[PDB]
Amino acid sequence: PQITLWKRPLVTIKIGGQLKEALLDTGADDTVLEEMNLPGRWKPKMIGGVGGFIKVRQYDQILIEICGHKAIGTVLVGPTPVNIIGRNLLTQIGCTLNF
Amino acid sequence: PQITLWKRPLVTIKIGGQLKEALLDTGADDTVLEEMNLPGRWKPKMIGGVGGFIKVRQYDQILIEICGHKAIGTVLVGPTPVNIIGRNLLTQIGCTLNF
Ligand SMILES: CC(C)CN(C[C@@H](O)[C@H](Cc1ccccc1)NC(=O)O[C@H]1CO[C@H]2OCC[C@H]21)S(=O)(=O)c1ccc(N)cc1
Numbered sequence: 001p002q003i004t005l006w007k008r009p010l011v012t013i014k015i016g017g018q019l020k021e022a023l024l025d026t027g028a029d030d031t032v033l034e035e036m037n038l039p040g041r042w043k044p045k046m047i048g049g050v051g052g053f054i055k056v057r058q059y060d061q062i063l064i065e066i067c068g069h070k071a072i073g074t075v076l077v078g079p080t081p082v083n084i085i086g087r088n089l090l091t092q093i094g095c096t097l098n099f
Numbered sequence: 100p101q102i103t104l105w106k107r108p109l110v111t112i113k114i115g116g117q118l119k120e121a122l123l124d125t126g127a128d129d130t131v132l133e134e135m136n137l138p139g140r141w142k143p144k145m146i147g148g149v150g151g152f153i154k155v156r157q158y159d160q161i162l163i164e165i166c167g168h169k170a171i172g173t174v175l176v177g178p179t180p181v182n183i184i185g186r187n188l189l190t191q192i193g194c195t196l197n198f
Contacts, residue, residue: 050148
């Protein structure tokens, strides 16, 4: 599909057997999701943006379905104000910017 | 053009007669640029990102050219980690997400 940018590009995602709303974010290197209890091992990480840094938990090879498009890769989990789908998964669903 | 997301979507912008590099950021409501001298009045504002809130100078009705496409809109100037082009300007240049 084509998504205009009049409003936040929020879409439904499926991760760990749960449906969530997440931002399709070309400005995010990696996907970061609001705090959630994912099983498995993880590695601590810090990501920086407007306002400074937050501490997140990096999970690898996590399966996410974005608008029926399946993807698998790194998913960060931490105190983000919004669920964010980053370029690491946007490339996997064939997402492009167009103007 | 069509821009894939294997790398950061960085583009050259022109603002205040000066060239700069900026990130096309569909996850940003607003456009935030690093510290710079701009003409015209400005009002102090607050903006929040993943790590908290920062103080910025708000410039309205500023001409800014993004990859040869002209826009006139609000530009926030402050201690952002990187120049980000947000939806307020992405819409003006006719930018959409496609997959
Ligand atoms: C600032 C960017 C270079 C990086 N950010 C992605 C960006 O799209 C955030 C993503 C974002 C969106 C909402 C809330 C927090 C973070 N948007 C943002 O900061 O925009 C601000 C200016 O316009 C306003 O609208 C949103 C917040 C303001 S980030 O959230 O900090 C980030 C950094 C690293 C990763 N792996 C994932 C995300």
